[PDB]
Amino acid sequence: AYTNSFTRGVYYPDKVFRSSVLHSTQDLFLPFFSNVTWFHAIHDNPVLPFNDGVYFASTEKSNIIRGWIFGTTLDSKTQSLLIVNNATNVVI
Amino acid sequence: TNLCPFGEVFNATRFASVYAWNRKRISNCVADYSVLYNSASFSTFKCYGVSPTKLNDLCFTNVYADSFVIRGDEVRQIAPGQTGKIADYNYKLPDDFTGCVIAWNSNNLDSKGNYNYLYRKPFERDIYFPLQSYGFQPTNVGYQPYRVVVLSFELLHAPATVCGPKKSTNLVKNKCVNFNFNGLTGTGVLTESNKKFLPFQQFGRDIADTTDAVRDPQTLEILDITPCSFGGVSVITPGTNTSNQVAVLYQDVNCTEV
Amino acid sequence: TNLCPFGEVFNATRFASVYAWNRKRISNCVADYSVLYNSASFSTFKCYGVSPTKLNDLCFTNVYADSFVIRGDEVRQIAPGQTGKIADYNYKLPDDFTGCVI
Amino acid sequence: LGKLQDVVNQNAQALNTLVKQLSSNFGAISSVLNDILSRLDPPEAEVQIDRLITGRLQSLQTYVTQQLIRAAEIRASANLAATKMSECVLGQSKRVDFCGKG
Amino acid sequence: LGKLQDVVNQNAQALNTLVKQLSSNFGAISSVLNDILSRLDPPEAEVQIDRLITGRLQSLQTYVTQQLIRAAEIRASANLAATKMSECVLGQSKRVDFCGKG
Amino acid sequence: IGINITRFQTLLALHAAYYVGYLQPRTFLLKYNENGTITDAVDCALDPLSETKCTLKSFTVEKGIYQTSNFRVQPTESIVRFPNI
Ligand SMILES: *[C@@H]1O[C@H](CO)[C@@H](O[C@@H]2O[C@H](CO)[C@@H](O)[C@H](O)[C@H]2NC(C)=O)[C@H](O)[C@H]1NC(C)=O
Ligand SMILES: *[C@@H]1O[C@H](CO)[C@@H](O)[C@H](O)[C@H]1NC(C)=O
Ligand SMILES: *[C@@H]1O[C@H](CO)[C@@H](O)[C@H](O)[C@H]1NC(C)=O
Ligand SMILES: *[C@@H]1O[C@H](CO)[C@@H](O)[C@H](O)[C@H]1NC(C)=O
Ligand SMILES: *[C@@H]1O[C@H](CO)[C@@H](O)[C@H](O)[C@H]1NC(C)=O
Ligand SMILES: *[C@@H]1O[C@H](CO)[C@@H](O)[C@H](O)[C@H]1NC(C)=O
Ligand SMILES: *[C@@H]1O[C@H](CO)[C@@H](O)[C@H](O)[C@H]1NC(C)=O
Ligand SMILES: *[C@@H]1O[C@H](CO)[C@@H](O)[C@H](O)[C@H]1NC(C)=O
Ligand SMILES: *[C@@H]1O[C@H](CO)[C@@H](O)[C@H](O)[C@H]1NC(C)=O
């Protein structure tokens, strides 16, 4: 499936306060109005490519989306990132 | 107040083979760069983005200690703008490297021969075969093994975690003062402020890329840094061919400063 | 017409302890720096605001010969802009030093 | 108000550009001058600072040159204005389309 | 037509000068940029290319500054022409020797 | 943590939808408000208006004509010509 990202995935590029200012930057951003690969859990969650990194909106009412895995080959012949968000904590 | 692990790093049992050099991140501690620089141990202490003298006054988000053994002839390669197959396949300092390179003879430690010392972009690691090794023996002088540490220093906008043994004063407000916050050196009128930093932010800025605000690193209040009072001095005079009496306009400042 | 006392410098019986290096003023004399520069006796002759070729054409209100012994590894320190414990404590050169190190 | 407002905009843009140019590193290791001075001893710092001086001074010479040429424009407009004051306020201008159409 | 032909000649001469400054080394080992980039890796080439940037940029600032001052001279000539257009085409001028002798 | 990434995969409990997108190197303009909070942005490469917004460093762009860039026809392929000795 597909949808449109619109204006989403913008983040604070640096830990520097600035205010009332039209500042400009270059960074890895989700491009405006880019295409969004809207997965579903119907009656599956495949391995995705990471590319230049990711945006991951994930509307919820169940709190069943609870973690992520990242890396090269995700198969013990590499170290690989795991994230869990179990009830209260973030655990990495 | 934790002391940093340089006593481990510079004494660690095996420095790695330069094809696969060690990297220890250092954080959350105080560093006596003076004791390292003054140490009799080091055959070289070449520094690039900073002078080894200046280090104690300045501090860093992190420091990375890249630890390995080289043949003593190789020390050339461990610099910006220097070349070689080791310094291509399995090492490279970037050509704008911010840090120091510390090296010394290890023939007493690392010779045996010691054929473990295998060799082959900036801080790249790689694992026909492009591979070679030394075989260090106590009989080896620049053909001997040498230990090197490269300290690469991190200057991101996060709060510092590795700092020199600098001692904090109390804070002072509403008065023109010299200051240093985590290595941000300057001079100005520190005042507490209503500029609401978001919880992750650690400096505040304006058009010039000047630090218009800071958050104090021990008590997390937000300070403006307004300039010390300044302005042109103009001397009002009649002709010297009339009188030697003069009046002085201190431009824009308030008589309270003068 | 006096020839300068470079023998009392370069052929002194002992040179000074570098913590307390000797300074000899030279004045009122004729100096063929080529006699020095052409001598194979010198492992380095590096100069920092003059070329050792040019010296015979140019002349000086005084010359100070500073003379001392060092460990052979140290020779790097004895230049403008250098660092090291001697260059910190007891032999800092001016960072615009005009002269020659031999 | 496009004329006067553009003159204000131009001057503010010239100042804002001159101000931004303090942040431009001109090939020095950093554009925060106190950072260079708190990183480096003078043997090294003087090259970095001299690149910043050369850049900032060239940027300042640029700004002042722009302001001299603009001040010549403004002065030509001020002499024009003073002439409309002299000929049209203090007087009546016989000169077609000098003081308004008609 | 010596006036107009000189404005054209000045602009063309300034452009031919601006172009000819691309033939100038400014102390870089060639003035054709791809020579440096084909001969040299970046750590070396940055040194050489900084001189071409600096020289070309100084030439460009020079050209633009000559053009700004020339543009003010042309603008003064345009304002003068606009004034003869207004006073003498759209009008008759009483200003003695403003619109031709007589 | 230094690790190289080319793949990723979410965890869900066996008992939903997720809207993956991808980042790109992009130039941007950002509107920080009075509370130092980003309220708006422009992706400069999106369209010729967004290149104009970035060229003026402004969110409004007024009625006009603005040089955003220089268009250059790209090299199709690389050609090599050495004497055939
Ligand atoms: C991350 O690790 C992978 C290996 O798991 C690297 O993949 C290779 O990438 C190069 C091009 O960069 C290809 O020529 C190889 O065919 C790839 N090998 C495999 C097994 O996929 C990848 O280069 C690494 N990425 C980074 C940015 O370090
Ligand atoms: C992009 O997504 C839209 C729906 O948002 C879809 O109609 C279109 O086919 C997609 N195109 C590509 C190349 O993904
Ligand atoms: C979450 O998981 C960690 C171990 O992964 C565990 O220590 C912790 O008690 C768990 N529960 C919560 C509520 O964090
Ligand atoms: C190495 O360890 C010794 C004690 O074994 C210690 O005195 C020394 O300070 C350590 N090296 C460094 C650089 O701290
Ligand atoms: C620093 O120490 C003081 C007490 O000396 C304490 O009040 C404060 O919370 C501490 N701040 C941090 C950042 O740990
Ligand atoms: C300057 O002073 C002299 C006497 O010292 C006097 O004769 C002369 O008139 C004065 N001129 C002016 C311009 O003040
Ligand atoms: C000068 O300083 C006093 C406070 O010391 C203040 O009340 C006054 O308004 C100031 N005047 C100006 C011109 O800023
Ligand atoms: C030093 O003495 C040697 C012979 O012992 C002589 O060759 C040399 O020229 C002398 N140098 C000077 C400067 O007199
Ligand atoms: C700024 O933040 C405060 C709460 O901190 C809020 O009440 C106020 O409306 C905000 N103003 C703007 C312009 O966002």
Question: How many angstroms separate the CA atoms of F6 and A50, rounded?
Answer: 5
Sequence-distant (6+) residues with CB within 8 A of C11 are: none
Question: How many angstroms separate the CA atoms of E52 and E27, rounded?
Answer: 8
Quick check: CB of F7 below 6 Å from ligand 1?
no
DSSP string, A21-59: EEEEEEEEE--TT-EEEEEE-----PPEE-TT-EEEE--
Sequence-distant (6+) residues with CB within 8 A of B217 are: B159, B160, B181, B182
User: Residue B122 has what DSSP assignment?
Assistant: T
Residue in the structure block whose two tokens are 């910006």: B80
Q: Could A17 and B158 be called an inter-chain contact, meaning their C-beta atoms sit closer than 8 Å?
A: no
Q: How many CB pairs under 8 A join A and F?
A: 201
Handedness of CA B52, B56, B60, B62 (dihedral sign): positive
Closest to F32 measured CA to CA, from A18, B211, B204: A18
- Residue B76 backbone dihedrals phi, psi, to 5 degrees: -45, -50
- The encoded tokens of residue B64 equal 């990375």
- Residue D63 backbone dihedrals phi, psi, to 5 degrees: -55, -50
Q: Within 13 Å, how many C-alpha atoms sit on residue A70's CB side?
A: 17
Q: What is the largest CA-CA distance in chain A?
A: 49
Sequence-distant (6+) residues with CB within 8 A of C14 are: none
- Residue B226 backbone dihedrals phi, psi, to 5 degrees: -70, 145
Report yes or no: B250 and B231 within 8 Å, Cβ to Cβ: yes
- The encoded tokens of residue A83 equal 């994230």
- The encoded tokens of residue B88 equal 């291509």
Q: Does B41 touch chain C (CB under 8 A)?
A: no
Quick check: CB of B241 below 6 Å from ligand 6?
yes
Report yes or no: A68 and F10 within 8 Å, Cβ to Cβ: yes
Q: Which of residues 30-59 of F touch B (CB under 8 A)?
A: 35-37
Question: How many angstroms separate the CA atoms of F22 and E45, rounded?
Answer: 36
- Experiment used for this model: cryo-EM
Q: Which residues of F touch A10 (CB under 8 A)?
A: 28, 30, 38, 41
Where residue B36 falls (left for φ over 0; alpha for ψ -120 to 50; beta otherwise) is alpha
Query: How far lies D17's CA from each of B35, B62, D20, D22, E34, in Å?
Result: 45, 34, 5, 9, 32
Neighbours of B179 (CB within 10 A): 16
User: Which protein residue has the closest C-alpha to ligand 9 atom 2?
Assistant: F35
Question: How many angstroms separate the CA atoms of E49 and E98, rounded?
Answer: 53
* Beta bridge pairs of residue A22: F31
* Beta bridge pairs of residue A23: F30
Question: How many angstroms separate the CA atoms of B193 and B224, rounded?
Answer: 6
Q: How many CB pairs under 8 A join B and F?
A: 8
- Which of B226, B254, B255, B257 to mutate to test ligand 7, by most ligand atoms within 8 A of the CB atom? B254
Helix/strand number for chain B, H first, E second: 3, 18
Report yes or no: B89 and D78 within 8 Å, Cβ to Cβ: no
**Long-range interactions of E64-70: CB distance < 8 A, separation 24+:** E65/D65, E65/D69, E66/E14, E67/E14, E68/D66, E68/D69, E69/D69, E70/E10, E70/E11
Min CA distance, E40 vs chain D (Å)? 19
Quick check: CB of B241 below 6 Å from ligand 7?
no
- The encoded tokens of residue C32 equal 């063929």
CA angle F47, F50, F52 (to 5 degrees): 110
Closest to B186 measured CA to CA, from A19, D53, D38, D31: D38
Q: Could A66 and F58 be called an inter-chain contact, meaning their C-beta atoms sit closer than 8 Å?
A: no
Atom of ligand 8 nearest to the CA of C10: 13
Question: How many angstroms separate the CA atoms of A77 and A82, rounded?
Answer: 15
Quick check: CB of A89 below 6 Å from ligand 3?
yes
**Going by beta carbons, is chain A in contact with chain E, meaning 3 or more pairs sit under 8 Å apart?**
no
Closest to B110 measured CA to CA, from B34, B255, B12, B186: B12
Quick check: CB of F4 below 6 Å from ligand 1?
yes
- Quick check: helix, strand or coil at residue D24? coil
Reported as type and span, the H/E element at residue E9 is: helix E2-20
Min CA distance, B74 vs chain E (Å)? 19
Q: Could B207 and D16 be called an inter-chain contact, meaning their C-beta atoms sit closer than 8 Å?
A: yes
Q: How far is the CA of A86 from the centre of ligand 3 (A)?
A: 6
- The encoded tokens of residue D44 equal 């090294």
Q: Which of residues 49-108 of B touch C (CB under 8 A)?
A: 51-53
Q: Which residues of A touch F35 (CB under 8 A)?
A: 19
As a three-state string, the secondary structure of C51-92 is CCCHHHHCCCCCEEEEEEECCHHHHHHCCCCCCCHHHHHCCC
User: Which protein residue has the closest C-alpha to ligand 4 atom 2?
Assistant: B7
Q: Could B197 and F36 be called an inter-chain contact, meaning their C-beta atoms sit closer than 8 Å?
A: yes
Which ligand is in closest contact with the Cα of B174? Answer: 7
Question: How many angstroms separate the CA atoms of D36 and D44, rounded?
Answer: 9
